[PDB]
Coordinates of C-alpha atoms in Angstrom, one line a residue:
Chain A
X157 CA -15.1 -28.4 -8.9
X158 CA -16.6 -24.5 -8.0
X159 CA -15.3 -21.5 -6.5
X160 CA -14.9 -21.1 -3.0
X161 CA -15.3 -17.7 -1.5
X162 CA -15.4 -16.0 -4.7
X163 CA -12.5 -16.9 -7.4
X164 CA -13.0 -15.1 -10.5
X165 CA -12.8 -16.6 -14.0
X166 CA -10.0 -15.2 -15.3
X167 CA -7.4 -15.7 -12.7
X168 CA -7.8 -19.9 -13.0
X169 CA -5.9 -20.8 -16.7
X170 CA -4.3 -24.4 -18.2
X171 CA -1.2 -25.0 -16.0
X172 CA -2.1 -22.4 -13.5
X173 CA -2.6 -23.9 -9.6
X174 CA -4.9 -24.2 -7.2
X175 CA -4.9 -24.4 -3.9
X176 CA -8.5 -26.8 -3.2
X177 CA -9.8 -28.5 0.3
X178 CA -8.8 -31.5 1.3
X179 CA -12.3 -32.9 0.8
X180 CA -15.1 -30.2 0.2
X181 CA -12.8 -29.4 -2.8
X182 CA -12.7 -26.0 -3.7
X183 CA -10.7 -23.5 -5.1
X184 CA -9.5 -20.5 -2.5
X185 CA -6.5 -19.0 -4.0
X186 CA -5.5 -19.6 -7.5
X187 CA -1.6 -20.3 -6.9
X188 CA 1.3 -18.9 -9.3
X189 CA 1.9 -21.4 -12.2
X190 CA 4.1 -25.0 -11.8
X191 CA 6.2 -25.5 -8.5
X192 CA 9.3 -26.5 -10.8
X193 CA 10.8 -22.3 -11.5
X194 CA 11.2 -22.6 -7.8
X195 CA 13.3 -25.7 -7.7
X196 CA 15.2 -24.7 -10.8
X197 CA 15.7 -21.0 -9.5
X198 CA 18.7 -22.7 -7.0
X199 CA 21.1 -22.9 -9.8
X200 CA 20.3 -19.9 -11.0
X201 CA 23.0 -17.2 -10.2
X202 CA 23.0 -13.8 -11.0
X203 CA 25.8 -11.8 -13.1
X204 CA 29.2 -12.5 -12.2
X205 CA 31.8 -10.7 -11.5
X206 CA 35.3 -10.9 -13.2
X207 CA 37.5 -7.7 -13.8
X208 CA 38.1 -8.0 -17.5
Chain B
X105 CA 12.1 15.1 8.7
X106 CA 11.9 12.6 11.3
X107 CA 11.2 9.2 11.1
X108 CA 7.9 7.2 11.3
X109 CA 7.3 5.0 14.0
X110 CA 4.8 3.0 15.7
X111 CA 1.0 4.4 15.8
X112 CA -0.6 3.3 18.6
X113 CA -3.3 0.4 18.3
X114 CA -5.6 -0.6 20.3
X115 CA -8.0 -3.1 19.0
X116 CA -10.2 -2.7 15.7
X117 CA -8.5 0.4 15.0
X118 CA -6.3 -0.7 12.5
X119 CA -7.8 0.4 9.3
X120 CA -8.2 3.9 11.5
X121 CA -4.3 4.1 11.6
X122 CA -3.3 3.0 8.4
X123 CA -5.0 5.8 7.1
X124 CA -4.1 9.1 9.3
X125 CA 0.1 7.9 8.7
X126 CA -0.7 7.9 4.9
X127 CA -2.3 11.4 4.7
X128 CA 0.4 12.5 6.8
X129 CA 3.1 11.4 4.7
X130 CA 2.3 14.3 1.9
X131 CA 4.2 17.1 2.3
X132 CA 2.3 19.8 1.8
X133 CA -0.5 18.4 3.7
X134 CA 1.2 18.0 6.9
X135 CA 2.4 21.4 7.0
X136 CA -1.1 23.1 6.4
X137 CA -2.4 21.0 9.1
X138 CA 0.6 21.8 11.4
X139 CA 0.3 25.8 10.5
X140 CA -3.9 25.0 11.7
X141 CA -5.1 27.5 14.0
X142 CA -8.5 28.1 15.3
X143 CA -8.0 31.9 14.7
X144 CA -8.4 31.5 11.1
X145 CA -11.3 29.5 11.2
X146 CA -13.4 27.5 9.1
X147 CA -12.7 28.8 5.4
X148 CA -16.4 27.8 4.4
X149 CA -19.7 28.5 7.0
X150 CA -21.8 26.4 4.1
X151 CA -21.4 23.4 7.3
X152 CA -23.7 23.5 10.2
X153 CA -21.1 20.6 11.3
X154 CA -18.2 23.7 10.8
X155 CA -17.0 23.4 14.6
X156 CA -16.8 19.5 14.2
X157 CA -14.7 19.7 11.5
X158 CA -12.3 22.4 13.0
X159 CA -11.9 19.8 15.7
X160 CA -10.6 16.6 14.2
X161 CA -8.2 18.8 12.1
X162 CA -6.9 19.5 15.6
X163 CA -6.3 15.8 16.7
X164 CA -5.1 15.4 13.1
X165 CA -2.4 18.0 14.3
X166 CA -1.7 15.9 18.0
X167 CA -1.4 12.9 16.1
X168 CA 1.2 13.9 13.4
X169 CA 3.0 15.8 15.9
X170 CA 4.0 12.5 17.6
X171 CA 3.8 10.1 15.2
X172 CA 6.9 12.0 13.5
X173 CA 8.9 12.6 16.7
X174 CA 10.9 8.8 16.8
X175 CA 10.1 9.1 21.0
X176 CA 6.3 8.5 20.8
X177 CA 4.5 5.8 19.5
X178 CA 1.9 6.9 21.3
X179 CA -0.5 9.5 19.6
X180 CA -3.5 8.5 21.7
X181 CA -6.7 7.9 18.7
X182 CA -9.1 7.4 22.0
X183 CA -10.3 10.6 21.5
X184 CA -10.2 10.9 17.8
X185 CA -12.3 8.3 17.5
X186 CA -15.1 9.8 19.8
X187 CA -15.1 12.4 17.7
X188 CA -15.8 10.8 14.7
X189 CA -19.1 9.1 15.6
X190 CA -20.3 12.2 16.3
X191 CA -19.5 13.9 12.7
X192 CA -21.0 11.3 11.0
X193 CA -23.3 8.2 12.0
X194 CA -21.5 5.8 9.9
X195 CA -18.6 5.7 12.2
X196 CA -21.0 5.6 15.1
X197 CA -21.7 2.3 13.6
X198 CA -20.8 -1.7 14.0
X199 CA -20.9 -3.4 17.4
X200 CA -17.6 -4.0 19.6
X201 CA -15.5 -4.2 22.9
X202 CA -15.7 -0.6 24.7
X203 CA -17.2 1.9 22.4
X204 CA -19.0 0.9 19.2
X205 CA -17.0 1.4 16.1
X206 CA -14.9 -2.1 15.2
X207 CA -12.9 -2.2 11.7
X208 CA -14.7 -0.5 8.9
X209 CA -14.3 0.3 4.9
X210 CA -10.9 2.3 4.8
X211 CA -12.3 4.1 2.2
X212 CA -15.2 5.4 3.7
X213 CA -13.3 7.0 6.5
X214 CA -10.9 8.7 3.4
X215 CA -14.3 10.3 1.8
X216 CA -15.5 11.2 5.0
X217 CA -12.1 13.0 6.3
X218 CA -11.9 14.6 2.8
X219 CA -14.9 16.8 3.2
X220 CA -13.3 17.5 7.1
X221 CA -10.2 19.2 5.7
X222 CA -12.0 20.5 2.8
X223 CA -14.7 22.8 4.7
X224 CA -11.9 24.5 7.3
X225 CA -9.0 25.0 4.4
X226 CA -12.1 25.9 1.6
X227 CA -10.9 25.8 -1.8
X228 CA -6.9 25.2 -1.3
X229 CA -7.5 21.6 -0.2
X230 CA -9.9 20.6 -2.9
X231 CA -7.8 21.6 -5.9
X232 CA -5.2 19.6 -4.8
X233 CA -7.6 16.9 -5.5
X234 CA -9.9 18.0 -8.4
X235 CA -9.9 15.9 -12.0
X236 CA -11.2 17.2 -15.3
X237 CA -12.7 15.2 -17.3
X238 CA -13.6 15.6 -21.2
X239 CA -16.7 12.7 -21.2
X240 CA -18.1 11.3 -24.2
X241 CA -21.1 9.4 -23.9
X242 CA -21.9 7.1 -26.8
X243 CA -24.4 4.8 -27.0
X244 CA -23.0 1.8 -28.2
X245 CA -25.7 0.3 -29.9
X246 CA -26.3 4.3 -31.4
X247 CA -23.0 5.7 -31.6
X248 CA -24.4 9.0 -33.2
X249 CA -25.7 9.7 -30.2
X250 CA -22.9 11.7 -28.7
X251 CA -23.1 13.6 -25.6
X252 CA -20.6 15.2 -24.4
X253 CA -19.6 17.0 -20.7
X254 CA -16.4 19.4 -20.4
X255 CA -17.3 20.4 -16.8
X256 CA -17.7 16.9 -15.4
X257 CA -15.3 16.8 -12.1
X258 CA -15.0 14.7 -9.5
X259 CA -12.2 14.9 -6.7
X260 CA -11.9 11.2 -7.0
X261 CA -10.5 8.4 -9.5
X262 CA -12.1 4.7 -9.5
X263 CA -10.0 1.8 -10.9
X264 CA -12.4 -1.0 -11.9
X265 CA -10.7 -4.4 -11.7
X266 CA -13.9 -6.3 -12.5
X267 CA -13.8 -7.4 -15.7
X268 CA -10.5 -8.8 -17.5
X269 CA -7.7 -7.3 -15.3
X270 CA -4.4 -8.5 -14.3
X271 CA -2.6 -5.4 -13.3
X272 CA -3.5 -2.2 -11.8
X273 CA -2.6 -0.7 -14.9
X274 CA -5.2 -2.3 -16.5
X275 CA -7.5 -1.6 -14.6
X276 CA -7.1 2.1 -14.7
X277 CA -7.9 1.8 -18.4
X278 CA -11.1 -0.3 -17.4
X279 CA -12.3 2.3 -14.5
X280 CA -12.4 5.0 -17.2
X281 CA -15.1 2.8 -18.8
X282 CA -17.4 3.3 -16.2
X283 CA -21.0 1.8 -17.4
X284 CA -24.1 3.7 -17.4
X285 CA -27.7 3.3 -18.3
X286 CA -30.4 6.1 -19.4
X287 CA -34.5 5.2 -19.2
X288 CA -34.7 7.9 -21.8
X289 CA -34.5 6.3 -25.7
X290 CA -34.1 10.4 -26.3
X291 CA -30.4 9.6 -25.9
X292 CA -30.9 6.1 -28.0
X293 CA -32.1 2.8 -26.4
X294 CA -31.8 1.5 -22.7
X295 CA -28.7 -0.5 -24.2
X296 CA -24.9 0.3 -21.7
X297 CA -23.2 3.3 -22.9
X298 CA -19.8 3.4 -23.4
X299 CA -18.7 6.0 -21.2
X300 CA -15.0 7.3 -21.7
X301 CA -13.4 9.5 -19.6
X302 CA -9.8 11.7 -20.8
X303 CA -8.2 13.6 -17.7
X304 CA -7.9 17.1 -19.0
X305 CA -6.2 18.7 -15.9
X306 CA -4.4 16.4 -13.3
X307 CA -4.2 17.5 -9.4
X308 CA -1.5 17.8 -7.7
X309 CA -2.4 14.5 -5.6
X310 CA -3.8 11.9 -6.9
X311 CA -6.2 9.4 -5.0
X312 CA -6.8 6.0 -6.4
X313 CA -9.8 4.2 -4.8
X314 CA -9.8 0.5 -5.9
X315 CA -13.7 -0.8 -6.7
X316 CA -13.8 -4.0 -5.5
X317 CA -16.6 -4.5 -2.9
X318 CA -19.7 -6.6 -3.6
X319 CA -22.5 -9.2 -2.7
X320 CA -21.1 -12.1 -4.5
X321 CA -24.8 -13.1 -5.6
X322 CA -24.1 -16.4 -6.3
X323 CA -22.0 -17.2 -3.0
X324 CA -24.6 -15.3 -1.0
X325 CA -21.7 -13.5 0.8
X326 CA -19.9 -10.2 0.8
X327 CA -17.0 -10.7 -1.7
X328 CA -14.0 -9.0 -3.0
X329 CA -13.3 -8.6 -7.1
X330 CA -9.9 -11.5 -6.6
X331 CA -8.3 -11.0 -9.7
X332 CA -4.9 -9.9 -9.7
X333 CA -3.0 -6.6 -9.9
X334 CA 0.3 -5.4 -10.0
X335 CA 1.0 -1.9 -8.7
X336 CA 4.1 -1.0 -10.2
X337 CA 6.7 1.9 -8.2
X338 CA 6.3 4.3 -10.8
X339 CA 3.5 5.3 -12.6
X340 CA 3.0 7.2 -15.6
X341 CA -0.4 8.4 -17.0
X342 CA 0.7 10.3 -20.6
X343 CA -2.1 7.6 -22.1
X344 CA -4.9 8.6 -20.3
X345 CA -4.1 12.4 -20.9
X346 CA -5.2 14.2 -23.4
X347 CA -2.5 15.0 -26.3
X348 CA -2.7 18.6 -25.9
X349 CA -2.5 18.7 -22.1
X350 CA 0.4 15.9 -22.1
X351 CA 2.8 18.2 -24.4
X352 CA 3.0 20.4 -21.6
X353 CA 3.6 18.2 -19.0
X354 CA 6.9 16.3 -20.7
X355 CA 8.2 19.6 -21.2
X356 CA 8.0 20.5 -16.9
X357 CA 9.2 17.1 -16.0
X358 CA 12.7 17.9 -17.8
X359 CA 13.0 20.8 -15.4
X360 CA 12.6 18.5 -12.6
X361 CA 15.1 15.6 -13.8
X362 CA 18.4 18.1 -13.1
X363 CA 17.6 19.0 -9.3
X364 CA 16.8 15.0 -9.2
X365 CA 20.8 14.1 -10.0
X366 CA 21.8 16.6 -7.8
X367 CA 19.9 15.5 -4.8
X368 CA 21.4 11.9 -5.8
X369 CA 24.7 13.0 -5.8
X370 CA 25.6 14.8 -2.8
X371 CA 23.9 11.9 -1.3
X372 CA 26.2 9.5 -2.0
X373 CA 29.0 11.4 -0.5
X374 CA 27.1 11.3 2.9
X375 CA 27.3 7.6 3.1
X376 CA 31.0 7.3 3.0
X377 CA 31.1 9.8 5.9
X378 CA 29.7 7.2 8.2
X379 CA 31.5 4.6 6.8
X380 CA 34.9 5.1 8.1
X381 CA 35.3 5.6 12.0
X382 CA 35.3 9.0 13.7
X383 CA 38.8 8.7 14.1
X384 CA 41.2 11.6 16.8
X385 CA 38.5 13.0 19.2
X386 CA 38.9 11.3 21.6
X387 CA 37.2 9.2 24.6
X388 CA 34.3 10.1 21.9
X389 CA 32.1 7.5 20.8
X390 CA 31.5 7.2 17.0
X391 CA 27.9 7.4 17.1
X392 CA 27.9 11.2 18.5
X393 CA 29.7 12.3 15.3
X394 CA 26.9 9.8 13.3
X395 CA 23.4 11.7 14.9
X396 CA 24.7 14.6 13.6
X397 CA 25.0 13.6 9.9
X398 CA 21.9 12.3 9.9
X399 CA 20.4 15.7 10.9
X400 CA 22.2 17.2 7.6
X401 CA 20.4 14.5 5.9
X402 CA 16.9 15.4 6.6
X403 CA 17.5 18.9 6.5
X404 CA 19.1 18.5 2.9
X405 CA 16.1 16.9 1.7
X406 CA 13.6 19.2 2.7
X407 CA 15.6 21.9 1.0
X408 CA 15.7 19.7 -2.5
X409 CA 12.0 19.4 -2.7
X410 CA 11.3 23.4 -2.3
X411 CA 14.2 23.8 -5.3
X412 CA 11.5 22.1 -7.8
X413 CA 8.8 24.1 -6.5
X414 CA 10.6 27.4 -7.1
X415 CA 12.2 26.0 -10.9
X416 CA 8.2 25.4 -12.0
X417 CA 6.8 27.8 -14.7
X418 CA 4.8 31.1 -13.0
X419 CA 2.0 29.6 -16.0
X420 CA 1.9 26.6 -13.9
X421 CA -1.3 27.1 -12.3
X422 CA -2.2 25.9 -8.2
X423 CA -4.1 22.5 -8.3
X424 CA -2.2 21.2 -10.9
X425 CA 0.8 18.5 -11.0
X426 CA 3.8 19.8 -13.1
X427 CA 4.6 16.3 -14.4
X428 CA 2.8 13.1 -15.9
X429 CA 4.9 11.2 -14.0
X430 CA 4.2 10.5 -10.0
X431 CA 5.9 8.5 -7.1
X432 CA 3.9 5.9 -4.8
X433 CA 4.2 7.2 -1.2
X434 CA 1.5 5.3 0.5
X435 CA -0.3 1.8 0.2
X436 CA -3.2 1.0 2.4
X437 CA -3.8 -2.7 2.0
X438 CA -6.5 -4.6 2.6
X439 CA -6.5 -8.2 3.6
X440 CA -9.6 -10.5 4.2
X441 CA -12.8 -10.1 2.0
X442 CA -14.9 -8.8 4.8
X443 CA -14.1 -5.7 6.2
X444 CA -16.4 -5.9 9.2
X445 CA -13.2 -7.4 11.0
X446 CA -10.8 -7.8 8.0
X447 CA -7.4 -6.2 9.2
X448 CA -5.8 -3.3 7.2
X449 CA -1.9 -2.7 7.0
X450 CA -0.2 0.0 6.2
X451 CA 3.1 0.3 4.0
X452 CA 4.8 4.0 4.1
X453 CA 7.9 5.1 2.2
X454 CA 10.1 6.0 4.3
X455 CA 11.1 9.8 4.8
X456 CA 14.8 9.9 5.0
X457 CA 15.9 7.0 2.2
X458 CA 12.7 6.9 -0.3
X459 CA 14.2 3.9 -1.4
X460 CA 13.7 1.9 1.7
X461 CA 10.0 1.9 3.1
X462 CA 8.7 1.3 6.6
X463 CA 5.7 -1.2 6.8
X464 CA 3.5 -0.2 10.1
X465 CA 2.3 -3.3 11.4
X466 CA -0.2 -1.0 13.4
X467 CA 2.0 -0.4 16.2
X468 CA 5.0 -3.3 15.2
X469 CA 7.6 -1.4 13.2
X470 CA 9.3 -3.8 10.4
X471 CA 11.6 -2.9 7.6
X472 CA 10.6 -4.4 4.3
X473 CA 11.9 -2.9 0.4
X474 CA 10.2 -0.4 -2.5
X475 CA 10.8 -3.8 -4.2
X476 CA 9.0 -5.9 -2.0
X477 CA 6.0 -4.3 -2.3
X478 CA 6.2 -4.6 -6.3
X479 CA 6.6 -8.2 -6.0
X480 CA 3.4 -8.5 -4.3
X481 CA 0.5 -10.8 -6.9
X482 CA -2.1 -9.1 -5.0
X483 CA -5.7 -10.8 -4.9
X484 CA -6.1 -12.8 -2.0
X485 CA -2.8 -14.9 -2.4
X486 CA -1.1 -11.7 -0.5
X487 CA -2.2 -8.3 0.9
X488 CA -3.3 -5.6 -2.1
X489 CA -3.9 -2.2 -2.7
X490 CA -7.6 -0.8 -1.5
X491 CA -6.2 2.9 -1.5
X492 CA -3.3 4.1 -3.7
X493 CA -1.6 7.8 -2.5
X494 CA 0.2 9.1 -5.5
X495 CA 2.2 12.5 -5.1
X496 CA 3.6 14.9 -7.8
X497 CA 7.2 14.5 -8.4
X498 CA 9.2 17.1 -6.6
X499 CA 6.6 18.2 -4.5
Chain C
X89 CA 13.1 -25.7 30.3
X90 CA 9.8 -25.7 31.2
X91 CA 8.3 -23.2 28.6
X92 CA 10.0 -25.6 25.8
X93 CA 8.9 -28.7 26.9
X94 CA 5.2 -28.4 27.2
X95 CA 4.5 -26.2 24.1
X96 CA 6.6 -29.4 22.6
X97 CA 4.4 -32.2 23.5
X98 CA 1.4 -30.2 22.6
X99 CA 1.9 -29.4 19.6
X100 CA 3.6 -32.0 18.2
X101 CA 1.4 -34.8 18.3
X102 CA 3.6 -38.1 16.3
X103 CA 4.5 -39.1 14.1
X104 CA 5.7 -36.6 11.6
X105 CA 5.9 -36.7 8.2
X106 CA 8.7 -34.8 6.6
X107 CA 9.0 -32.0 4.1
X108 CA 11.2 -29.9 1.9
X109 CA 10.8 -26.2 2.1
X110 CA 10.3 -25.3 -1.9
X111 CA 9.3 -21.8 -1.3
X112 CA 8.5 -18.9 1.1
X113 CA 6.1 -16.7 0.5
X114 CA 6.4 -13.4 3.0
X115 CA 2.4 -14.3 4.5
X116 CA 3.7 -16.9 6.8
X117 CA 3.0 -19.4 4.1
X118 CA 5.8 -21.5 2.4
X119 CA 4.9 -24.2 -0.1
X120 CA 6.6 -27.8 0.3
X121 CA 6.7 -31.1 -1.4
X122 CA 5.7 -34.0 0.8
X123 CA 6.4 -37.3 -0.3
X124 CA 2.8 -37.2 -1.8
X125 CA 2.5 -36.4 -5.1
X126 CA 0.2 -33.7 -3.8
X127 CA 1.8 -30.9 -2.0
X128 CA 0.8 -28.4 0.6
X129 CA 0.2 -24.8 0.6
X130 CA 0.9 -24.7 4.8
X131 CA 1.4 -22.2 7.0
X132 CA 4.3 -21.7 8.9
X133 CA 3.0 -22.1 13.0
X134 CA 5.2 -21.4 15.8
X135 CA 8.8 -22.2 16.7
X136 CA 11.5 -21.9 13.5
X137 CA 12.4 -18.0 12.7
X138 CA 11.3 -17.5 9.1
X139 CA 14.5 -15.7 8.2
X140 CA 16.4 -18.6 9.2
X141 CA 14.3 -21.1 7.4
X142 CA 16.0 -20.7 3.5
X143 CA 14.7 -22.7 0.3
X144 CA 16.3 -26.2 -0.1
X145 CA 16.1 -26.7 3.6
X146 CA 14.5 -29.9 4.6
X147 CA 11.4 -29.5 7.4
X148 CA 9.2 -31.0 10.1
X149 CA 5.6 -31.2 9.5
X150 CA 2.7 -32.5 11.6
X151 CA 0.9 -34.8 10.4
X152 CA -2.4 -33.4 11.6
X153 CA -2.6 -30.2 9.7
X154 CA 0.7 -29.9 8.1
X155 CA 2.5 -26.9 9.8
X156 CA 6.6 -25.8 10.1
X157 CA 6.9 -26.8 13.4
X158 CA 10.5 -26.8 13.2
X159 CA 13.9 -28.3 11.5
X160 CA 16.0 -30.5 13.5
X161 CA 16.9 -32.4 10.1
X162 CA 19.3 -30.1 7.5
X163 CA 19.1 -32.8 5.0
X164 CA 20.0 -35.4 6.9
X165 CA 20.4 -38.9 4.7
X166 CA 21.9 -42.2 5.9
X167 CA 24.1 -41.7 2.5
X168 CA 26.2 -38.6 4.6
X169 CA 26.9 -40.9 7.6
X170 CA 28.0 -43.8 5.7
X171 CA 30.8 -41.8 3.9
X172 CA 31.7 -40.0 7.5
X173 CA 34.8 -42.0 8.4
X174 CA 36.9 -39.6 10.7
X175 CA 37.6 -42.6 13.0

């Protein structure tokens, strides 16, 4: 594929997403890295609290 | 004092408003322009456009007036705008609805309303905006070539974030390598110099002007640099400075660290005021007891900021920052690539908790977090920084 | 009534192909997983507040251009129901 509007180089990397058309396919946004932090980020809790 | 509201909108004036709420926000500023008289004048008659320039500094006045007072979201930018087409024909520019004006480059209207404030104040304005730079220019293909400028000033800081950039802090690094060219092989080749700038005296505020606008040559279309930054709350610029002018500056900031706690603490004991009821008063509501706390409040603050003032060394020297550290008051963003109807926002920490910040929505008033806006990825994936207003600590 | 009903009909055109809400992104933009293997960067349009839409929440889509036009669903599965024996 080819940039769309203008996507720089540097922000497109192995593993890193893209948001693309559905059929003139091309990149808009480069999107964060994997979908599966945000799944796994729902078990994820943050420090407890216990009076020791 | 009090708090920020509302500034009205009325259709491709956005970018207009994002910018008068962000000088406001400065301390200092606001009250020079609120003390603004036209008995003292213009400070410089070097302007044949002298009694322009008196004149917005007067509807500068209107609107901050009313933008503080938590009654009026009105401030009325009709005639403001009138007046800046005729300053200066790039405002009188752009087809539109009503007058001829539409959305423009946020940063030209900053340069533009720089010079306004600067010819009717003189000097005083500009040295709270003036950067020193020690320049060494060195060929790169003939780095014996050295040439160096001591005197080389500018009021204004680029931050480059074309090339390799991921963060705004890169980037700072990146806009002091500026790239030059000279026709003359008297300074060794046509080759890019290497151009490398150290800040030798800060100011006491600090504008950051993102680069980022361009013809995309191979799109054939106006473009925007899309690589991502990260504009962290606090920033800290002991790298950039110079060794010997950074020694000084860590020493002042200590100063300024003790009248920090105690502003912290006899805020905490404000909170727990409100907390409980108003208890025996009675047929009172609580909230008459509440508006009055929050009065203190304001008040208190004003009062801590003059402390630092007074604590500074009599060395320290008008038109300089006491500290290499500064605190983000203001973020214009930018969203959309062109800016001939692109729509500006405008994010402004919020006077009485600088922890919490007030994102104006143009006229829409919504309460978002310090942290929120440090989460933002920037580029196009979410709205980033164009303009960056960076204050000294304690001022 | 009358307000909800006709904005209803218009925008939903049927049928409608169900999401899961993976993430928000404050932009009124969320990303979901339909049950494509591809999944959609969409924006959020009209009805639902965003505040009340949380991650893990399951979402109506239209099938035209895939949009949040609501929840009506809260994870509803058959496998719920079958274990509901109050009677």
């Amino acid at each position: 594929v080819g940039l769309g509007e203008r996507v720089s180089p540097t922000d497109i990397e192995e593993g890193m997403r893209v948001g693309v058309d559905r059929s003139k396919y091309n990149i808009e946004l480069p999107l964060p890295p994997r979908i599966d932090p945000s799944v796994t980020m729902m078990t994820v809790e943050e420090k407890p609290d216990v009076t020791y | 004092a009090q708090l920020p509201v509302g500034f009205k909108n009325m259709g491709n004036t956005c970018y207009l408003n994002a910018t008068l709420q962000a000088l406001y926000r400065v301390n200092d500023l606001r009250d020079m322009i609120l003390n603004y008289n036209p008995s003292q004048g213009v400070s410089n008659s070097g302007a044949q456009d002298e009694e322009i320039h008196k004149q917005i500094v007067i509807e500068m006045k209107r609107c901050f007036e009313n933008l503080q007072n938590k009654s009026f979201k009105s401030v009325l930018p009709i005639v403001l705008l009138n007046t800046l087409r005729k300053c200066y024909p790039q405002f009188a520019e752009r087809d539109s609805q009503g007058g001829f004006y539409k959305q423009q480059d946020a940063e030209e209207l900053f340069t533009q309303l720089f010079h306004s404030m600067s010819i009717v104040f003189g000097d005083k304005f500009s040295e709270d905006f003036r950067i020193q730079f020690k320049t060494t220019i060195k060929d790169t293909a003939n780095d014996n070539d050295i040439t160096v400028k001591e005197n080389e000033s500018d009021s204004k800081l680029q931050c480059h974030i074309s090339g390799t950039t991921n963060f705004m802090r890169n980037g700072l690094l990146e806009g002091l390598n500026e790239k030059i060219e000279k026709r003359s092989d008297l300074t060794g080749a046509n080759s890019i110099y290497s151009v490398e700038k150290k800040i030798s005296r800060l100011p006491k505020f600090l504008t950051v002007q993102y680069v980022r606008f361009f013809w995309k040559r191979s799109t054939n279309k106006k473009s925007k640099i899309l690589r991502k930054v990260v504009f962290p709350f606090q920033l800290d610029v002991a790298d950039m400075l110079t060794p010997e002018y950074a020694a000084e500056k860590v020493k002042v900031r200590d100063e300024l660290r003790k009248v920090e706690k105690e502003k912290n603490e006899k805020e905490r004991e404000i909170k727990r005021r409100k907390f409980d009821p108003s208890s025996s008063e009675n047929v009172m509501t609580p909230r008459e007891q509440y508006e009055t706390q929050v009065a203190l409040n304001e008040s208190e603050k004003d009062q801590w900021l003059e402390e630092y003032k007074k604590h500074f060394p009599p060395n320290l020297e008008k038109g300089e920052n006491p500290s290499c550290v500064y605190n983000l008051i203001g973020v214009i963003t930018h969203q959309g690539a062109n800016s001939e109807s692109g729509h500006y926002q405008a994010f402004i920490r919020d006077e009485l908790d600088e922890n919490k910040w007030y994102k104006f929505n143009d006229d829409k008033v919504s309460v978002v977090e310090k942290e929120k806006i440090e989460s933002l990825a920037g580029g196009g994936e979410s709205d980033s920084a164009l303009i960056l207003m960076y204050k000294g600590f304690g001022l | 009534q009358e307000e909800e009903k006709k904005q209803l009909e218009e925008i939903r055109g049927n049928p409608l192909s169900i999401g899961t809400l993976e993430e928000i992104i404050d932009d009124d933009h969320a990303i979901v997983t339909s049950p494509t293997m591809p999944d959609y960067y969409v924006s959020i349009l009209s009805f639902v507040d965003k505040e009340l839409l949380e991650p893990g929440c399951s979402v109506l889509l239209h099938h035209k251009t895939m949009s949040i036009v609501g929840v009506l669903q809260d994870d509803a599965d058959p496998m719920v129901s079958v274990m509901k024996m109050d009677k």
